[PDB]
Symmetry: D2
Subunit: 396 residues, 4 copies
């Protein structure tokens, strides 16, 4: 049949993939090659003119990576996909394909740190200006739009407190003003949120997180209309960033995404249990999790997301020193950056990543001294809870 | 001892590598990971502040990739290396790190096609203008320099006829005017040419070609001063292109480069034999190979290159149709783009890659209708010669 | 803490693994090496004498494979593990380590085909005799025991109709007579059955099936007492079969087993739904599945197994031709041998694998003309059911 | 054409390989799969009956591994190849396929240690007796033959002093008496010696050594007549040892063997230079190297071998303590077991591997207290010589 007709779990397993045509191999072969051989001058010419299907060179395209791209296009309900060397490369390949000197972007302020760095420091040096706004307030997005605005850029849920952005509303605002909406869907995966179905034009992911899910791949993906993806591929990737994905990385990501449905279900079931535990703990001042009814945008979450996600942020009593004590007291949770791994990961930005940053600078970014971010893994939730309880009690 | 003190073959094998510290494993382990775990909040903070050695996240750095970077820095006699997702990414990460809106670049015209596309179409759209010149004439480089020129960019030998550029002379001209010289050393590898030793500031490679050598990796490398590489890493790669190399790709490239010395010796020995055969063949109008005494810049080649390389271009009698007939008549040489593989590769641009291009447009790029490019592999040269003789005779 | 103290899901994720000591890498590094380097003659001597921890050579042991071995030992509640090149190698390394000329084995008859071949044809040619019995009847096992019997060998559930063997009862019988009990636990995985906890001495798996779960690894594992595993390693593997596992295969298996808990839960939930559908279908004469109350050994299953498994066998009305028609009519289920993959796999032995076999020979092995074996994957069960319904209806 | 018609270097690069049929990928794809899918019941049946070409299951066969098997068959001038999990598995799969209880083997005494262990301790326990002889004396081989002798087994050059065995003469003796000759060709590779061309029936290798050459694969290969290889595959491997090779390992070995010709040339050129240096050194009592005219079987070597190999053994003045001092004093050579890597490896058996062994037991095996074994790598020979000179001088 057509893989676009099956249930979502069936698609996760099968979409974009098929047994190898020459051998019947069930696993997608790893086409770890740089180049491809033609049977004749004519076949070569036909492919370079695009009068013929087939491969030429891995930077341009590759059968293993094509399977991943097609799978993710199916899962996001987009026309086409483009795999990249990293999440950052997915974002920059996208924006550098769309924008040129004199153009403007309206971006959420509550975004991934490195994305913020690209937008605030690099883009302007190429003559592309960026206005940062609070995207939880769609009116701020409207107010910042200019005649030269080409793109509105958002993430939801957002760092660090998992605030939300109303995708459908923002899409309508962007489109009314003739701009595209690009959504970073990394935190949710297509299993939990589908920005294209809500009106977004382009979705990007760091597959480094949930899509791969196994903490062993750096990579990104872009999904959108064929006409845009063709430009992102044959100009953005080919000429500008050169950020192609290794066939081995694509194969690992294909392998990891096979279990996306069951992983997300467990991540989110575990996260809800842990979030409820934290919300009841007298040493914890705040818990940020879309699945708690106390979330300021709970109702939007119920409309836009199928599950509340696997990430929790929370604030511990006693600020900086308590956060440090707590994170140094966990025995099961692992101190690391990143998220979406099978192992539970924990970080305390004020004493770790953002130690080098001024306290007032941290606050403006929504990072309080006691803020802890937890990526909930696939362990027994009782074990994670017991580890957190132990560490919190010691710290406070 | 210090690996920088050994002979070049010893360095090829050993530089940048060591047995694994925890296990003694001889092969560099494949650190196919996204993230790294800290033992404490304090250790995490120290690494983010750069007060401590150690890893954080593979996009920023990785032990496997670090070995490759250090090895290539040693081989090029540069301070530091930076691995990338592709040769293109090495070039663009370099130039986008160095240049901003209002800046200017002077570039050779005889350069890699996709590089030409980036420089001619993409850079100007970011407000960075490029002047193209004939770099075989250092005076044209001087004449094109402007107060805003930041970079002079060259490749040598150059496509498609393997003309040369005088690195030392061009370096002096660039430096007198306060610009950096960037050299694409892909065709030669560090075994055959060392641009940094001749005054270049930065060297880039597609490792897809000779450095890896096994036709199974797309990748690039940048070598230069520590201060520049630090910016290329923590700004160019981290924020702008996102073009990081997969640890698996770095491991394959480490593995491939182990045999760089013996491969280049054989590629070049084979190429010289084939070039001499072609030069004596009455159906071949021209042969472009630095190792032939008839090369217009032969003497420069002898001063700048340790070996004449593994690439040959030649023109067959009878133009377009003869080139097509010939390439369709080889039985051993493989019709493919790319170069530097263990297999002999052949292409006829006018009937293949550049078929879609106007004949006069091809000519301006130095591509005549009968021009064939041959990447000489590791086969017995008698077999390659016999295959060429057979195909040439049939075609003419 | 100690990984043996955590919940089973926590163990699945964490047991046998730790961040890399030298780098903190979260993913177990792929130690794809043949040999290991010593810091001194003395260190080498200490390791060969076994007076020192550390590695020597990958056939003897490897850090990546050691992690897998330790994880599986934890999951089966055994002392030690030994990884192998295949499930077959796990079985033969085990039995060839234990048995010599003149020894005897009592084996179940309802076992994996290739195991049956080894036991019936190869063992006797080495002077090791085997008696085959119906292991669903523990009294047949007792009756076949001889003074020279060293081993009783069983699989449960068994091929092809998923009959069971009472592990605890058989263990007691074997031990009373001074024999070891070896159990092939492939069909269940440690998540669903724990033979060592029921008195078995040694457990073997083809990790090719559920433990890896991703249809991309051939491999085996042996778990048992340290003293036995040491002999299986330093004699059986080192000298006799040479069946060591590649570090890359061990790494993939580690990666696959991370999701064992969530995969088995979904496989079994899906299988129960499909089995109930089949049991209600008028074109299906019989359904063999431990989770159906009509299973002849249902109660034993409830005592010995935590879940009913992901495999179903069933008989279609109309025998050979109907089975052929049905299997040629599925659109989602894939025609293939093997089991435990994320994709649903289906086979019809009488028209496929056992076509070359005489009908009466097939019957003696429990293979009827209409018997179909289904390995239930991770797709939406509604999609699998609809595919089966469609194919069954067309066929009957 | 036919790959069996090209020169040996051409065969090394091309034999057994072809661009991928579905995509044209130049690198042999990594078919990292367990199973294969059939298009119909009929296609499945045809393959199991062997009425049809195609794959079924990786333990039985795999497209990546098939390429390696075919390549090595071409290089050894044998009909067919069979890849295995290790060199040991190549040997035992071979001998356990050929021999049964009551059979007899005549083996060289100067053989690989683990092979000796299998033959002396394991085989007899399966009722297969082995007579060990000095194979440098073909008359000892004849004298040990019995009516039940099925196989004569030899290695050449032999451990530890690189003595030789006259393959052609021994083949004639074996055949006159109705036995097969099996030759372990690991030390030479097919580039330096071709036992099948001299009358051997079966060749085995540890590909862990020179064939792979990169110190990152454990693996073996068997080459012989189709009828024998079919039995070794469908009985020996399938049922008995289960020692199949991982497709990834086969792919790495294919990749490594591409440079076999150029590697062996350099290994042997380097080894001859080092051997001559050692022969002139007053602190070195003996040097064992086939390339020295003082070798007791020099003339046989010139007739049987195309190059003298990359391995050297030598004895240092001062026995055990001097050997220990010397090996602890090298700075470039790496202390490790194994051989055939790109790095120079060194070991001193009396103070390392064989420390746990009684001095008189070592002597009987040809291991003197001052004996050092050197696997010469691809480094500059001047650097290796300088390292050896430094270490020898310090030690003596
Ligand atoms: C900038 S270093 C890497 C940071 C992780 N991507 P974050 O913890 O998801
Ligand atoms: C733009 S497709 C790839 C072209 C090869 N890099 P050229 O043949 O080296
Ligand atoms: C003997 S070919 C392989 C057969 C699979 N192991 P069965 O379908 O689990
Ligand atoms: C028995 S441990 C491994 C020993 C190496 N194969 P030898 O040094 O070639």
């Amino acid at each position: 049949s057509d893989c676009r007709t099956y249930g979502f779990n069936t698609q996760i397993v099968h979409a974009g993939q098929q047994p190898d045509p020459s051998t019947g191999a069930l696993s997608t072969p790893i086409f770890q090659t740089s180049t491809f051989v033609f049977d004749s001058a004519e076949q070569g010419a036909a492919r370079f003119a695009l009068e013929e299907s087939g491969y030429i060179y891995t930077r341009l395209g590759n059968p293993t990576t094509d399977a991943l791209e097609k799978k993710l296009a199916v899962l996001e309900r987009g026309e086409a996909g483009l795999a990249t060397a990293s999440g950052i490369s997915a974002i920059t390949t996208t924006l550098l394909t769309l924008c040129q000197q004199g153009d403007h972007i309206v971006s959420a302020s509550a975004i991934y740190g490195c994305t913020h760095a690209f937008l605030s420091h690099s883009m302007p040096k190429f003559g592309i200006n960026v206005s940062f706004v609070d995207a939880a307030k769609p009116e701020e997005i409207r107010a910042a739009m200019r005649p030269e605005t080409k793109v509105v850029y958002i993430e939801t849920p957002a760092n660090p407190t998992l605030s939300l952005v109303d995708i459908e509303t923002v899409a309508g605002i962007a489109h009314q003003q003739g701009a595209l909406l690009v959504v970073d869907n990394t935190f949710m995966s297509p299993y939990c949120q589908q920005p294209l179905q809500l009106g977004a034009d382009i979705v990007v992911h760091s597959v480094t997180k949930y899509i791969n899910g196994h903490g062993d791949v750096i990579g990104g993906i872009i999904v959108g209309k064929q006409e845009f993806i063709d430009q992102a591929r044959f100009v953005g990737l080919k000429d500008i960033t050169g950020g192609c994905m290794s066939p081995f990385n694509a194969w690992l990501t294909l392998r990891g995404v096979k279990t996306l449905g069951i992983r997300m279900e467990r991540h989110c079931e575990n996260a809800l249990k842990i979030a409820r535990f934290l919300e009841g703990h007298p040493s914890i001042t705040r818990v940020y999790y879309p699945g708690l009814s106390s979330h300021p945008q709970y109702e939007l979450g119920q409309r836009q997301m199928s599950l509340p996600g696997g990430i929790i942020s929370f604030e511990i009593a006693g600020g900086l020193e308590a956060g440090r004590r707590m994170i140094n007291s966990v025995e099961l949770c692992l101190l690391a950056v990143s998220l979406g791994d099978t192992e539970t990961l924990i970080q305390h930005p004020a004493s770790m990543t953002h130690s080098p940053v001024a306290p007032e600078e941290r606050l403006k970014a929504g990072i309080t001294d006691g803020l802890i971010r937890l990526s909930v893994g696939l362990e027994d939730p009782e074990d994670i809870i017991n580890d957190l309880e132990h560490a919190i009690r010691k710290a406070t």
